[model samples]
Target: GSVVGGLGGYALGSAMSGMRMNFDRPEERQWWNENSNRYPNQVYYKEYNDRSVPEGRFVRDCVNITVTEYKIDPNENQNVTQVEVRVMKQVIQEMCMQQYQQYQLAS
Candidate 1:
């Protein structure tokens, strides 16, 4: 019962607290569309490098990973019939030493 990147938490923070609203920014909007029903549902990962640079020192890139609760197979009972339902995905970001950021509703 661990939930990460809960949209319910995201919805609670409006733009009123000196914070830029997601809809008003393309980047946040992208994250929103990516995680919400409007975006693709795929557990994917990607990497990018710079070839245009002569030395190829550019590290700029984008990455996405998703883990979900399998709702269609396992069930309340082995005899229980399973059905397709909206998938629940947990989003996570981490770094070395296991220290990272957490999303909070307060400004």
Candidate 2:
């Protein structure tokens, strides 16, 4: 007849299979969102000004300028793949550049 060891081994194998299935999909991955509020803020630029001097004036004129910075959450839960992170970074960079250029031109 079968021994106690046989049943114990079967139970252990079944438990391992269940654990594997549970981990097949990470819980964090399921709830991950790239555009979530949890994302970090980044400063892309600092404000500055250009000085201009007039031949007749002792004081120099200053033109206000600003630099901007873009930030991304490198630890985003959904960034399981490198491609996703890369694409997101590229999009953010483009948007930051455009906004900065517009701000400069307007000023």
Candidate 3:
């Protein structure tokens, strides 16, 4: 006796799966435009080699901004931007700690 790969009647189904809507520029120019004031000097997207992986971690000034996905709403004058800047700095340090610790775990 032999077995076959099995067959389908091609009775495919396709309902509806609609997804709702979701969603920089040069690093130096952008830094001058937005983050120059956030930090002391011009911030750049420095890629720090992970040494273990091809992808490097993102750093503005010795902090990590590596991310899988991100969203931003740039409206208002300065206040909104200011708040964003502050939070990012805060999170960078936070994220930095986590990533740094990652090295030890693997080592």
Candidate 4:
């Protein structure tokens, strides 16, 4: 029973990971949102989970930041652009990684 439970858990975790790996970027999300006339439809949920899951909580937060920017300004010509979202994500990841490294060094 323990072996069966472990195998099932591993399989479920792997499947979820695979689903998250193929998630789209903010640009892709924006395109879908425009086409579907919905901020976060079923596709967005699938895509969001796909993008955020593997990245873990930090990356998930990054995705949320990007999505919030997009939601604030849907139009390309608006103040919040897709490029900005990408840049923000990169910056956050870099900063977080640096902090994590520092913590490890301290420890």
Per model, how many backbone clashes are there? Answer: 0, 6, 0, 1
lDDT of each structure? 0.24, 0.29, 0.33, 0.35
Worst 10 residues of 4 by lDDT: 11-20
Off by over 4 Å in 1: 1-22, 36-107
Q: Which stretches of candidate 2 lie over 4 Å from their true place?
A: 1-79
TM-score of 3: 0.29
lDDT (10s digit) by residue, model 1, range 1-107? 37433233221112122111234335444544454342223222222232232111211111122222222234443532211122221211111001111111111
Q: Candidate 1 or 3, higher lDDT?
A: 3
lDDT of 2 by residue, 20-84 (tens): 11112343233333335322222132222532223112111011111111123446554345543
Error of 1 at 101 (Å): 31
Which is better, 1 or 4, measured by lDDT?
Answer: 4
Task: Rank the candidate models, highest lDDT first.
Answer: 4, 3, 2, 1
Q: Candidate 4, residues 71-91: lDDT per residue as tens digits?
A: 544364477556445544443
Per-residue lDDT of 25-52 in model 3, one digit per residue for the tens?
Answer: 2433444445443332111133234534
Residue 4 of model 3 has an lDDT of 19
Give the higher-TM-score candidate: 3 or 4. Answer: 3
Please report how far candidate 4 places residue 47 from its true position, in Å: 28
Which wins on lDDT, candidate 3 or candidate 4?
4
Per-candidate TM-score against the hidden true structure:
0.15, 0.29, 0.29, 0.28
